[PDB]
A paper describes a structure:
For comparison purposes, we also determined the cryo-EM structure of [name] in its apo form at a resolution of 3.83 Å. However, the BTB N-terminal α1 helix in each protomer is tilted away from the BTB core, thereby flattening the V-shaped scaffold and further separating the two KELCH-repeat domains from one another (from around 9 Å to 30 Å). Thus, [name]-induced LHC binding involves significant conformational changes within the E3, which are accommodated by structural plasticity at the [name] dimer interface. A comparison between the free and LHC-bound forms of [name] further reveals an open-to-closed conformational change within the E3 homodimer, underscoring that the actions of glues can benefit from both local and global structural plasticity in E3s.
[name] contains an N-terminal BTB domain, a central BACK domain and a C-terminal KELCH-repeat propeller domain. Together, the BTB-BACK modules of the two [name] protomers give rise to a V-shaped platform, which holds the two KELCH-repeat domains on the same side of the E3 homodimer without physically contacting one another.
Residue numbers in the entry:
A (entry chain A): 7 to 518
B (entry chain B): 7 to 216, 218 to 518
The structure:
């Protein structure tokens, strides 16, 4: 305020209180939401009589705002009937509107997606969309795709597209694929079908349904049939100690969930840290200065890349496709000093730079690359007495605006955990059998601990995610077969899957 | 956080978004306060018929909540009628329950005082009571007193007593005084009525009334305590004849019978001065650390402990809260500026230094309010050697010691003088630019005084006492003295009696 001759405090000024939001907005939280006292309309769903306010409904769902505001000849009654929603689904909806904690079931999940879009709740619809982006299986990604192009939700129509494009071979015989309109089929094929699924045969088998008139589209479909070559899934790099070598094998999952070896490339120098970027290794090791060797599935010959500045051991190498970069967060120097120097290697130009340092230095952490944010889980850190105490810190170093955003909560455990990104979640495996299902968006931990029957020894469990099903691996086994389990997160059922016959499983190693 | 295995993130969930504060709290303010909609209950005040929401009325009030809740034939009709409320006052309550701006005037201020207390409105009964504690003149010092002792408000009953016991002599002739209840008269007498107002005669008025009220003979006499008046204006100024600085003391009276008081004398020069209680603390001389404490009629200049950190042209304020003489800011002779504080006590004589300020300032003015110390105006220099005036206001907390700048600036800057008055902090700059401060409302107020009076630019000093602003003009061209009274209700500058002060210089004026 600068002036006004009329505002004279002794006769006439103008009151201006700054507590009109801390007493009216925050004030109306017990009279409306918690303790419903004054209710206006009675929405009726099936054979029920709900008592819902006319105020809080129009502040969230704009569709309800149009039905209440637009007074007409039918607005004289306070009983409003609904038709689309069921009796046991509207209650879940009215539980979200008032409180904000709706328990999302499994079977009644496609029903809180169709009705949550007509009411235009832009917060539940953006969460039921993420639910359908991670529960998609090989037999379900043909109705979900049809369910995403009708509501115009590109965050699901693309997440449910990389299920019928990487598994088109099995879908060939299915009766749902035969009725697929030409509009959707020109997107599944054009998205880069892998060669192993026979993309050129699905088109031919599909057009034989209505050859009387469907032959016109046959020529156009074969024009856009971009096929991407087959990659190898897990770069299991075996660090044998009996023989000075490193059998960097490349496991290749089959169609029926069977892993087979596809290369026995070897190196003589020691290994400090390893990372895979797309389809190639970028292992780090050797005597000083810290070198880098890059391998490939088909090359079967190690190349050479730009030397590592700031040589150190126990890195936390991560790799992103949303960023042609390979970071080197954390690590401790040769003099047992926990340093923090995030590096910004690029594959296009073999040159190193430096970026914003971490808030807290960690060594031997876990590298998770969920979304475009690099997550550092676990590790070790010395608090006061020069002694490395196993810490539990979740750092969130970014890649767009480089800054550290340490979360205000800690992990259930600590140590030398190994992470493996799966869909939106980030699975974690501790020094034992305590597999957690940490979610970076909801900030919750749902540890689905396996039965302690197979816990004879405190052996670390390596975890790898490939083809939409994580394969929790096993270290050196007591004179037997490696426990290459195939844990199914949906059912928490662990199944022993063999097919790998290697001699490096007798000793510890690194993974990718 | 955490969970257990009944929360399988593939088929189970507990989705809980911590964002029901911008979609249910912000989405309701614009649907109820700003854009009034979905009205259900109609309030039928006399003459008119308003429409109000059931959720906003019961969220700020309590009488309005315990009345809609009880449906004992009080909410089913929905044509409910309110009584003992005028048409105009209720419209200003809708303006307050809703968006939150009120236009409190003087015509309707007692009706909104009682009505806002009947409806249990909490925040409105903290500025409508501050208003009454701000405009109690002698003529209505008793209609407000009895109003205060009906709703149990100590912020007004203890503020309508300091302004109703000093003017006890004039209230004696008033008819309302003779009808005083026995309880009210007891408290106003036993608070230190000045000896010049004849406290003994006040009881004699009831004695000479002519029964039932005449039985009080020994009562109300043992509880009377008389103290001489000692709060007045201290004036500092050197005569043109000699360098002997004078400290003439004058006191204001309601009868305008100014009597010549003792003329205090002093030898050295003055750097700064403070007014605490009924004594004057003078700093200055050849060495700035000299503390020559003076008084009314003791002619004593006892030298106290010197200041450990010597400063020149600093600010002295008295916050009785801790019987302290806090010396905030200052100037250092070693090509730098001081930021320390030294509060010389009376029975302790301590030199403690607390936390410094946030923005450097020197040669400013200070005014104390309810313990909180405000530093306003002054000058600040920079490494660029630029004489940039400072328009930043500083607050010195009395409880948390959290000095911080305010998100605004004064309308002007330079060398100013400040003197509190009721709940306001008046500001006078170089010219006719009166500005009234208000820490609670965080707002200002000017008067737009024309410059036709200040022909020559000269410093103006302001002193406030007995609820009447006094403004003193400095450096007149050998003419009549200027003791303009600045009654802030309406601009009523009148020259008072021409006392022969004969001081053509004004160093400091303290009230």
């Amino acid at each position: 305020p600068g002036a006004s001759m009329d505002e004279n405090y002794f006769v006439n000024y103008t009151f201006k209180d700054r507590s009109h939001s801390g007493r009216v907005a925050q004030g109306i939280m017990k009279l409306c939401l918690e303790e419903e006292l004054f209710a206006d309309v009675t929405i009726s769903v099936e054979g029920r009589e709900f008592q819902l306010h006319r105020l809080v409904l129009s502040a969230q769902s704009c569709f309800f705002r149009s039905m209440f505001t637009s007074n007409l000849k039918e607005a004289h009654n306070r009983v409003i009937v609904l038709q689309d929603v069921s009796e046991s689904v509207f209650q879940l909806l009215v539980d979200y509107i008032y409180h904000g904690t709706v328990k999302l079931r499994a079977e009644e999940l496609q029903e809180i997606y169709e009705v949550s879009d007509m009411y235009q709740l832009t917060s539940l619809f953006e969460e039921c969309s993420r639910f359908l982006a991670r529960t998609v299986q090989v037999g379900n990604c043909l109705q979900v795709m049809w369910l995403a192009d009708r509501h115009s939700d590109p965050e699901l129509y693309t997440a449910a597209k990389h299920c019928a494009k990487t598994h088109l071979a099995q879908l060939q015989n299915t009766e749902e694929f035969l009725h697929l309109p030409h509009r959707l089929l020109t997107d599944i094929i054009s998205d880069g079908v892998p060669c192993s699924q026979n993309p050129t045969e699905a088109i031919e088998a599909w057009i034989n349904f209505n050859k009387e008139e469907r032959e016109a589209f046959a020529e156009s479909l074969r024009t856009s049939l971009k096929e991407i070559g087959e990659n190898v899934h897990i770069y299991l790099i075996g660090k044998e100690s009996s023989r000075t070598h490193s059998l960097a094998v490349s496991l290749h999952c089959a169609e029926d969930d069977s892993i087979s070896v596809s290369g026995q490339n070897s190196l003589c120098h020691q290994i400090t840290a390893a990372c895979k970027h797309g389809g190639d290794l970028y292992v780090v090791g050797g005597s000083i200065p810290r070198r880098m060797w890059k391998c490939n599935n088909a090359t079967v010959d190690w190349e050479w890349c730009a030397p590592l500045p700031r040589d150190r051991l126990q890195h936390t190498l991560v790799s992103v496709p949303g960023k042609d970069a390979i970071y080197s967060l954390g690590g401790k120097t040769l003099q047992d000093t926990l340093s923090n120097a995030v590096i910004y290697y690029r594959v296009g130009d073999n040159v190193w730079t430096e970026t914003t340092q971490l808030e807290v230095a960690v060594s031997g952490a876990a590298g998770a690359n969920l979304n475009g944010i690099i997550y550092l889980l676990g590790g070790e850190e010395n608090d006061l007495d020069f002694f490395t105490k196993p810490s539990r810190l979740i750092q969130c170093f970014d890649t767009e605006t480089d800054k550290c955003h340490v979360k205000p909560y800690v992990l259930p455990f600590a140590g030398r955990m190994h992470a493996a990104v799966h869909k939106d979640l980030v699975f974690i495996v501790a020094e034992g059998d305590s597999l957690v299902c940490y979610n970076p968006l909801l900030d919750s931990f749902t540890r689905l601990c396996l039965p302690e029957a197979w816990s004879s020894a405190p052996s670390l469990w390596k975890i790898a995610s490939c083809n939409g099903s994580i394969y929790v691996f096993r270290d050196r086994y007591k004179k037997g077969d490696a426990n290459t389990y195939k844990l199914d997160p949906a059912t928490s059922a662990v199944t022993v899957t063999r097919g790998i016959k290697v001699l490096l499983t007798n000793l510890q190693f690194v993974l990718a």
